[PDB]
Design a protein around this ligand. Sequence first.
Ligand SMILES: [Zn+2]
Lengths: 48, 397, 133, 397, 147
Amino acid sequence: FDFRNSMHMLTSNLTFTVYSDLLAFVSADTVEPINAVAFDNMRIMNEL
Amino acid sequence: MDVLYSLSKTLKDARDKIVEGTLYSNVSDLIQQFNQMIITMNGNEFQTGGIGNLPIRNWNFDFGLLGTTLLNLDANYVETARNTIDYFVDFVDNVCMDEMVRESQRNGIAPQSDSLRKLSGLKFKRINFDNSSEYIENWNLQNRRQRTGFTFHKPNIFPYSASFTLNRSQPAHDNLMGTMWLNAGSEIQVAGFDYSCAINAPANTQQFEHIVQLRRVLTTATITLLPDAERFSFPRVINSADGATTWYFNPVILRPNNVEVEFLLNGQIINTYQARFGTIIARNFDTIRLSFQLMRPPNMTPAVAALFPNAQPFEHHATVGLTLRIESAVCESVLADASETMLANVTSVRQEYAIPVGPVFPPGMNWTDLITNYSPSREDNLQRVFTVASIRSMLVK
Amino acid sequence: MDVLYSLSKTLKDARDKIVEGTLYSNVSDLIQQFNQMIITMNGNEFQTGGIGNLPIRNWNFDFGLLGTTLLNLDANYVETARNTIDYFVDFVDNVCMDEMVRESQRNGIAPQSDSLRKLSGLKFKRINFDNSS
Amino acid sequence: MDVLYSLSKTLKDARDKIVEGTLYSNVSDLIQQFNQMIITMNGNEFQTGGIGNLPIRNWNFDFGLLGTTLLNLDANYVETARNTIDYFVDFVDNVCMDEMVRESQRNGIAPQSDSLRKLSGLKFKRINFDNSSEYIENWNLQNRRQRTGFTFHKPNIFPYSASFTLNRSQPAHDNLMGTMWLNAGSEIQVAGFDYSCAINAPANTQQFEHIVQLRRVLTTATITLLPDAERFSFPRVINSADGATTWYFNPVILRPNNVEVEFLLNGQIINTYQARFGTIIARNFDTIRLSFQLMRPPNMTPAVAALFPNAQPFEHHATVGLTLRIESAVCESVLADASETMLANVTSVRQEYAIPVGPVFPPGMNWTDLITNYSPSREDNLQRVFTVASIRSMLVK
Amino acid sequence: GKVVDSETASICDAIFQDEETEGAVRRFIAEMRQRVQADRNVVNYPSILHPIDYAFNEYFLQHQLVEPLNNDIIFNYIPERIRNDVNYILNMDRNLPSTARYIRPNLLQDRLNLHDNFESLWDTITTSNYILARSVVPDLKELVSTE
Ligand SMILES: [Zn+2]
């Protein structure tokens, strides 16, 4: 056993915060069904 | 100013004491000092140049401290350091140079540059250290009204002067008597000539004398004094005093008789030597007086007698001379000498950057002109400028 | 023989692809190959020279591998490596030269030197690679 | 500097290994390296130009990365990449060119431009990789310092020199003896002539000699040596040494007798060849000495006898010669040769952008002038400049 | 001085006292302190392991599979579509500390081509993916009275 050859220095980061699931932070509502539109843009379900 | 100094012995005692290998505690007292600096710096902005062909460079600071650890310095430690020093090196250079040109009359002894005027600031003094560099050692003691000079060499105290004085002459210049000399640097050569070989002189002896007044006192001078002036021992055709014609000098050399050298200080004889050739000491003087004589030989072999007739034409001109060289000396004022590069450094930086002639120094930092009229202002500026050159040479040669 | 080759592209593609900085993954496929060598070697003594003005330098082996850990090579990594390569360099030179003089009328196509005759050995062929020269 | 290199093998080993098709795997070890770069960059503003006719394009950095979420590269992947490379290409060009002109006496071996001075910075070293390009391979080895070296086909070691030396001549130039030669590039042709055909010479043999001193040592040279100097085998009217008149040379060629070629190093014979024509090896030399003789034919048929009378006029001038060509060699210093485009690249970029003559290189990068006074400064600048040209040619030809 | 971990600690206190261990040792152990840079998030702690150990733990550090995180990335983990489908509203509300860190989802495609022999299993997949679907397909509304 030789000391100096065993002693190393450490590069470690500092204080994260791990997040899972994710999404959630997504605030999202929705128009009222009667107002749908397809790639079309004219309106889906337009037979009043 | 003193500030400036540190900045260097910092780096030298740094770029030197820090290398792949050394144990820990051989740099503890050092590392510390170092960091202290970095701190004081970071944040303060600097500027250099704006004069002649001097690159107006801008400097900034923001460098991490250290990993004050690891035992036997690992290579990786060095490189991450050298890279931080090489900004200070290339810096200081641009700093020295900037204040190594500006001249000021009234009060020229002090700092000038927008770089240094900010260094003498108080918030910076937190740095000064290890003032054993002969020059700083002397800078300080000077701001303290106190005595002490520097050790010089084959010094440069005599402004170039090469001339003659005819004590007896006539239009034909066929029977002259006088002296001719060369004072330059640390050397003096002087010859006394008498075309008549003292034929009609009292006691058949012609007296000569050469006086040289130093612009600054030299102390503790080791001097070589030798008989004869080789420089004036050969045939010459010289211009007359009025420049209207030329005369012929055809020397034959005799030993100088009753040689007496006096080293005076304020008119007082401090050292006197009678016919002593070889090495002599002149401990404190501002003037050198060399007195010597030509004595007509009382006994002459035919060959000699033939050179010295009782009547003109005088074709062989009796000449006696002396050579004096100041090998080393101490001066309370900075001077150029044969070993130090200060004058050359200052002159070189100014020449390289096409620095315009200023109000203090003669064009080209001409030494003869400078020492001939070595005013207090020129000396204060010279000392400031020489001290900076010496600070610079600790890192950049 | 083919052995010999590797020993070099090993070093070149080495003394070349290893500079203060590079992100590891440019050499992962390289480091490996390298080490493999060291192993096979260590423990076997070698002899060269023995003619005209050719010194008789002797050689030995016993070297540490190469931490394949780090992500970005630090200067310190290099130096501790270059010092180990410079023994192989100054070696190979003395190796080439030794078999670059001996000649044989009969099988003057095969290996000769006490240095190489041992290289064609089987326990060594664990090295060959990148024969594009 | 080394930085610079990578930036390229990066792109080449890139614009080459990245195409519609291939399996990711081929580039995993590659992609990575790449990205690493982008990061270090983005956010740093760069300036190029500011001299002669050199635009001053400014560059900003804000680029995305490279998903590693694929196996087979779809065309769409390429184009979104090539568009990002074409900014680095058109960049590097403007970068090389900028530092491929500036010169510095003091530190010519170093970086200059506001573009590169920022590259040697530490925060960038995070890139360097795959240094197998013959030139960089040699750049590095030169900074740690050791046995560096290159390869050249018909190198360019001899500054152009075409002249003669008359060892025996007279006003009428009707009975001359001497040598004439052409040293240029990798070739030497030298002829020794004796109008008298050694009629009054000891042993009826006239000795000749031609010495050529290389400005740099060449090692491992493969050389062709042939008898005769075709260039000096035809009738000529030449200007006299003083330029006052012209002489007539009407050669008739004989085989050079006792040919001896010596390749010397520091005055020592390293290789010597006696009358060996064809291919010879000179392993290490800084000087070539060619000695050869004209021996009057002891037996002559009438037609021959008629050319060489016992008395003047001498109308057919006996001539012997040699031709030596260095096909290949290794030099520790960069040189121009018959295959590499380095000199031409550097010279061409400077000419195209009307770059003013600087303090280091002769006007027009003139090879003869350069090699004639191949100072350390010119060599360090040449190597820097040649290495950059080689980095540039990996992408732009 | 503050140090790495338990073992690291022990060792020091231990040797510190085995008299026959160069006065240099105590020194090093002594004055050697941690490294704490608040800004940036740097922490260089003095340690001790072993060649083969450093080996390990090392790479564990150089491969901290943890990328950053901006409002922008959250926004992006979203199909290029939908965002461009007016019918749906998007908005942000929580902020993001420069502390944000996630774990790459790793979505390399098929890699294995089972869709050309492993029928048996595809059927089981489809089935699955299918039920999955029904669970989502929104129920209908407002119909015409059966009767
Ligand atoms: Zn001396």
